[PDB]
Symmetry: C2
Subunit: 390 residues, 2 copies
């Protein structure tokens, strides 16, 4: 058996939604197919992957460096010790051959996208959902019954006012989510507080509301927002300052004693480790948001999780950015704290399996092989169409 070919294509997820840092008018993502010669249920096993919103597609990197490099390897060199499934670890090593250290951006997305497809294929060859594969290999067969999820939206948009924002959040609550997340930092403080007030009329307690500044604030603005946010008792205050300005987050923690979250824009275990060492994150109350699809994949994510354990952090503090089924499987299989979900934005690259409802903030995973792409009609149609695998 072998990987026969790897295909890539670029998809559009463009719209005029905006956070404090960017708008999404040009936003794209990569989709990948890892085609094998293994037969399951009368058809070839093909693994699929895509990268999360916000970083754009990485098709250039995929086609110029990573796909050729992986496809020039001897095919047996990519197999596990049984000879009857792929080895994501050998594949990762091949992908990263002749890559210099540092510079963890863009190529991190290319590798993350291939890694997703590789794990999808491995689980399909094994005949199990990915969470089951991961629980069996890494957690002694113990998987979570379900995963904590929150609904992320609350973007700025032309003409969107507090009534529309309330309607949005009510629609998330009606779909089973308890906790929601909104953007802040893209309007004057008083206007953001009025937006927060409006959402709380819908969701009740601050316990049910997260806010995300998308890394836009300098220290003075981060502290000023913090002081204004304190009375609301929000579930978390996310990415106040630049994702790499570790000293800024450490100073902010001296002034804001309620939970904070960051890390979606750190794309390696090295960068994650620097956050842990230098960022003043607090293991009993803060949250880490690393996204494997943007960060060289699950093979790299396991190094990050090992580093967290060695530095006194629980995996239960990790709630990945990105809203994807790959993270959902990792959460239940490796015991993360939960997963972000997008009920509205970035269609069709959002949501989990069709027909499996979120119930008071928790969702179960389908007993279907792989990551679960085939259980999302619209997304699967879009991906197989783009990649020519119908």
């Amino acid at each position: 058996m072998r990987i026969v070919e790897i295909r890539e294509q670029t998809a559009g997820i463009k719209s005029d939604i905006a956070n404090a840092f960017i708008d999404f008018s040009q936003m794209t993502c990569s989709v990948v197919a890892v085609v094998t010669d293994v037969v399951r249920d009368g058809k070839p096993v093909i693994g699929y992957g895509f990268n999360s919103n916000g970083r754009y597609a990485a098709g250039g990197l995929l086609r110029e460096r990573f796909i050729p490099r992986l496809m020039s390897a001897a095919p047996d060199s990519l197999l596990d010790e049984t000879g009857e499934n792929l080895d994501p670890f050998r594949i990762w090593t091949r992908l990263m051959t002749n890559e210099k250290p540092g510079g963890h951006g863009e190529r991190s997305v290319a590798v993350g996208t291939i890694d997703m497809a590789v794990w999808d294929a491995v689980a399909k060859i094994a005949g199990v959902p990915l969470y089951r594969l991961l629980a069996d290999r890494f957690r002694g067969g113990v998987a979570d019954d379900g995963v904590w999820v929150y609904a992320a939206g609350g973007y700025y948009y032309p003409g969107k006012d507090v009534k529309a924002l309330q309607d949005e959040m009510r629609s998330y609550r009606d779909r089973g989510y308890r906790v929601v997340k909104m953007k802040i930092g893209g309007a004057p403080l008083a206007e953001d507080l009025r937006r927060i007030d409006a959402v709380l009329e819908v969701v009740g307690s601050g316990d049910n509301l997260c806010v995300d500044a998308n890394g836009r604030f300098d220290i003075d603005t981060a502290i000023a927002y913090g002081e204004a946010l304190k009375p609301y008792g929000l579930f978390w205050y996310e990415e106040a300052g630049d994702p790499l300005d570790y000293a800024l987050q450490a100073e902010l923690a001296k002034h804001y004693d309620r939970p904070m979250a960051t890390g979606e824009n750190l794309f390696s275990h090295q960068d994650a480790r620097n956050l842990i060492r230098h960022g003043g994150m607090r293991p009993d109350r803060d949250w880490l948001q690393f996204d494997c699809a943007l960060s060289y994949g699950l093979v790299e994510y396991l190094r990050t999780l090992d580093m967290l354990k060695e530095n006194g952090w629980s995996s239960r503090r990790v709630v990945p950015h990105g809203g994807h089924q790959m993270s959902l499987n990792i959460a239940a299989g490796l015991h993360l704290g939960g997963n972000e979900s997008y009920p509205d934005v970035f269609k069709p690259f959002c949501g989990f399996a069709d027909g499996i409802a979120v119930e008071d903030g928790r969702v179960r995973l389908p007993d279907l092989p792989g990551v679960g792409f085939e259980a999302k009609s619209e997304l699967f149609a879009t991906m197989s169409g783009l990649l020519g695998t119908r």
Copy 2:
């Protein structure tokens, strides 16, 4: 006046040379032309740029994200206050619009390459060498008369032995360089020590030799090499450990009191700042090697230089990676410590102006408009050919 078009192409700089981390068998770089409608000396002013070795080309990024952004901007919005030259700062802002923070790799190379071409064009429109434009605008008209340069090579290569390494270093010294740099960490310690011994027979004092581990060592290996290197009194010990593992460098500095150098693989002012805060680098003796062509260009490099001043570091501690004329101009115009040079590797993307000799480790800059590409016959022929401007 305006930018009429921006062109890009990929060049090969492939060979089987190797350092401790990678070999260069698939190495590429981007070349860019920024075509204006300004006439100087009877022809269109065209600015040129290329990115340094080691990070590969970024053609996909250039074509899919960055060039379309500039080319969709209102032409007047890219000009400076006078209306008769380009504004690299407005251009940089346009290039980075809708880019999320963190993730400083690959896109840093795309932007660095366009920025080089932009400054080349600006200096040509002003009619002066770039170092003169920079000295006048940023240093009250004071430029260095010349720049300190060292010869970087000493790569591993199949069949290459100590005799060939000696011949190499002799040829650098014969071309006017006093100090040379070689690679270490790609062979057992004893074999590297024999290589170092062989080179010192050519260059004499350790004062004339740098060694570069290309980020390959864990802390134990970094310390062990340090202990073995101490008796030689080397000019610097470069990039012992992972470029992002700041705590490792800080620990190493407790064990190795002689000069060390790092930073070529940090591609933003944020990442540079983290090295300065957390890496235990010593402003009195250590060296910083940030490369603008890989790091979103000179506009971003100015932010890094401002950060260094605020943090008690002199610009004289900065000696850029990459061997290019862009850095040569920055060095003289903004008062850096020197520039890396490549007399053998990465042809034709190496060396400075034809016909201007290095003399005991110092080189002057030509009084010619722009960065100086046209003064390098082979490089300019190659670039103009690739970009369709010949």
